[PDB]
Write a protein that binds this ligand. Sequence first.
Ligand SMILES: Cc1cc2nc3c(=O)[nH]c(=O)nc-3n(C[C@H](O)[C@H](O)[C@H](O)COP(=O)(O)O)c2cc1C
Ligand code: SF4
Ligand code: SF4
Ligand code: SF4
Ligand code: FES
Ligand code: FES
Lengths: 263, 40, 428, 212, 51, 87
Amino acid sequence: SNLIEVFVDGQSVMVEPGTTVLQACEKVGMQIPRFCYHERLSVAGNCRMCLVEIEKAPKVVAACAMPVMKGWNILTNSEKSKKAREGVMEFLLANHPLDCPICDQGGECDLQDQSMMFGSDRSRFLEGKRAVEDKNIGPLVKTIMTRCIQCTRCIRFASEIAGVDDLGTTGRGNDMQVGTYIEKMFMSELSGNVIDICPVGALTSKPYAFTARPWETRKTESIDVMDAVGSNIVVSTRTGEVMRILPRMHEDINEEWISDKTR
Amino acid sequence: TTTYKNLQHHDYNTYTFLDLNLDLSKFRLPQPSSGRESPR
Amino acid sequence: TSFGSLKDEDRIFTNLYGRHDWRLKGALRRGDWYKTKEILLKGPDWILGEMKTSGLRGRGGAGFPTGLKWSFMNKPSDGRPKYLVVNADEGEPGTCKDREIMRHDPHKLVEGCLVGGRAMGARAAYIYIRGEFYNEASNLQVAIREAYEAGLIGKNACGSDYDFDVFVVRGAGAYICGEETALIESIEGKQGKPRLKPPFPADVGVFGCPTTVANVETVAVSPTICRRGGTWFAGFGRERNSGTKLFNISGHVNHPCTVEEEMSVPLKELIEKHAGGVTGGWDNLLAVIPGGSSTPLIPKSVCETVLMDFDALVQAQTGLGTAAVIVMDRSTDIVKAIARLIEFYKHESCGQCTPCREGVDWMNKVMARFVKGDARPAEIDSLWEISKQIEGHTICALGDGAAWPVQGLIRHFRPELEDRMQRFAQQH
Amino acid sequence: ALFVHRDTPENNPDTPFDFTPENYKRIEAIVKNYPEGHQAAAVLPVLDLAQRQNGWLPISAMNKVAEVLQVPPMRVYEVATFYTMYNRKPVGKYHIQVCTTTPCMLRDSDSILETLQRKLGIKVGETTPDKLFTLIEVECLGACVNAPMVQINDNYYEDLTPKDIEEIIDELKAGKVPKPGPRSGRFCCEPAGGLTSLTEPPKGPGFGVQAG
Amino acid sequence: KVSPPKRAEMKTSMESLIHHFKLYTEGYQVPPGATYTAIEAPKGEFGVYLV
Amino acid sequence: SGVNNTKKWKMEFDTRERWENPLMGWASTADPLSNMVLTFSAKEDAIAFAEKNGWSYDVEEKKVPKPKSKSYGANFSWNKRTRVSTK
Ligand SMILES: Cc1cc2nc3c(=O)[nH]c(=O)nc-3n(C[C@H](O)[C@H](O)[C@H](O)COP(=O)(O)O)c2cc1C
Ligand code: SF4
Ligand code: SF4
Ligand code: SF4
Ligand code: FES
Ligand code: FES
């Protein structure tokens, strides 16, 4: 009935066709890493971090893109798929500026953790980094692009959810650098969600620049007002005050993301 | 014959190429369509 | 067999060296558009029957068995049209072979779009050609105009019911855009960024339609292999590797050339029969490179015993790319050479993948630190080790092709680096 | 220069750019070259055609192309930035770009360039005060066999020596484009010691047909 | 990831700065288990029943 | 994108007055039963625990996201409208 026997370390998960390898491994409870992949954005292999050895093929495969075929066994904790992650994070953490006690996404970093969980401990990098020329996108979004990792999770947002087509990638190699070729102001509704969607703290919130740090907070789940959608929210507090207004995932309401007025 | 016989490409110019694409917009047959005027 | 002569009757690249009038009326004398009317009508499955039985493998840097590749779209009615694309982007440092096939015999390259076109089943073909190759392309459209004006293309292809056109897309100066998919995305008017490979180009490709990205050679030989052979072409070369090849020779050699001997010949001959011996003799010939750039060294410990197959050079820990031989000599800076090969890829990586934005530029900074000798030796067993972090961890085979030159430099020429770690270390 | 814009008076989106009348009649053949949809596939040639009308594509041409094709303007900036054959600073008139990969460097394509900076007096990327020349250290150009190389905006001088430029650039400054092609005797890329491969009157039509 | 790096190793390198920023904020995520380390302090069997 | 801080059934309580200390600026309180997380593994085990201790529950059910058909190739369509740009 349009199902595929798929294996995950010997499990017997049945999945519909057109499913990705992640979706085959989320039904078990295995969260393969990711920077390029957002569940609600188009697919592009740019991080190359979700790799898995696919049981008696020689070459690891980008799990975000691959449709699982038939009877394959994913080995997510192999001796190979860990060399395929300890060697990627080596690179993401090579030209990267050690601005963690500046980076507003300190504890909210999907790149500190994955390094601290699946990456290595030491740098064999001793050469010299690069620095990128920062933009002035506006009074909401605060670009520090020395630390962008080119995951294209911000152009696939401004072209498929907002309908803008502005934040292109300009160049090749390391000299490639996300953002407008010119001085333009990405001032739209749903412009504050590039903050929440950039896992790196390259572009973050300018008002909530340095008022807090995420472990400091207390998070209470409430609702939006001020538009009649009744969108769901996580109001985060710091000792009897308000510091952010984040979204909750709820499927009927917005989908996962909120406007700029209510944050 | 021991003489190179492709010397005519010496006296070419910037518009040599595209002027022939223009002349080759008459011999051609009409191209398909996605229905859309563009992917927007 | 100690083959390698290839009497000039069997040359499938006549006019290559310039003479005998590349134009029509000069390619008609050499045999082109001769029986192409019934090449088509006899069947698409018949043509591939004379590509499979010929053993015509790839001719780019991959070497895939053709016939199987074009049969990936011999489909029934999908609904979309079907296109063909042709990597005239030469690219690598050594691959002038297509700078001499576009002019000096364009009509052969226009055939295979039309012969191979019905073979896979198509509506038209896009000859993506390099941005700097201008005069090359003008020779094409002057040859493609003559093809339309002769009744050979357009609504009655050589007097038949097969409608077809040949379009010439023009690049803008890149090497990655010759890849199987950046090609396809560059034609679509975007960044030349390759694709991942569950959407194979034979199922969704250029303009969302299925394709067969061929090499210039792989189509230029299609017309005059199916009228003139299919088993003839098999007898030359070995069993899996059967054919000829536009060998291409350059660097520290008296007469660097383009020649097409019979494929799989001993490499000793290609610098002695043709392109007379390297400048100085045989104390020299240090560091031959059989492929263009994306293939590791072969240090003259093997070079006399070499057999230029695809699969024989595997045993030499190398591979045949586009058959663009580079040859160094004993009086060089071998690190300075390969340091530029990585500089060639730092200026050229599209910047998409993670271990190619900053794996190639990571190694540029290291090999550059080996030229001066301002590294130490314990990086060398790492600089290797990073090179295998890139191989299967990239979309296109550049990360393969950007580590393989480096693995060829450590596998043999380790102590020459160690020598320079010391010379620097002699300072203080 | 830097993959980013700084809206100078001469590089602002109010400069005079507008295609010639015949060029508008030429952009249409480029869009009939690609299907009804996907007319945004013409961003590569059309954006050269702007560069051919005038070199050094200004910001006003990187937008106008979008206006002619209805593409977003940003998708045009991603192209020119990605490619090297497109220019985005002002240049001279002849654009003398040199290969310096191995098999051209290996054959001393530094001497072709060291004997060029002295004949010119221009380091690499800057230009004459007369603004005719731009030396560029480019990577590879296809004709790697013909040992060193340059490229005067379109043409291929190759297999040449330091003494071979000195009649060339003297004929660029007050002369014509001096005979593109390899020096040293070989016509196109022959073995430069007499032919070795064909040497014979190539076979005629139908030679060896397998009974079709 | 269990013992933070040198105070100078976390100023050239990145990873050492990240693990420094996690060791001294969160910790290092021991696995679930339980032990009893009985140690002879001068009083005696000083014990710790971690869970 | 981390979803393992889910998978439990914490039993947080309402918040109350947090007055700023007149001396210092510190947020001070009187309700100690405010920083009061308690991790469970099932909903059937939580309401059985708060009914017991006299507390008044207010449940909010699980929110799992849908599974969503996501093809890398729909970005490269002839007919469709998902034909992406920027590769
Ligand atoms: C980075 C990269 C660059 C490439 N550049 C070229 C090229 O410039 N010309 C070419 O013919 N092939 C190039 N290739 C190899 C193509 O994949 C190959 O030409 C094409 O698949 C033809 O396949 P075939 O051998 O079956 O004809 C390149 C591959 C990579 C990974
Ligand atoms: S994204 Fe920010 S917090 Fe994460 S590693 Fe980079 S600088 Fe540190
Ligand atoms: S700015 Fe953020 S979302 Fe955009 S490419 Fe860089 S890391 Fe990815
Ligand atoms: S390996 Fe390099 S050139 Fe190839 S797709 Fe990835 S980033 Fe681009
Ligand atoms: S997370 Fe899968 S390729 Fe980026
Ligand atoms: S290496 Fe110089 S033209 Fe190719």
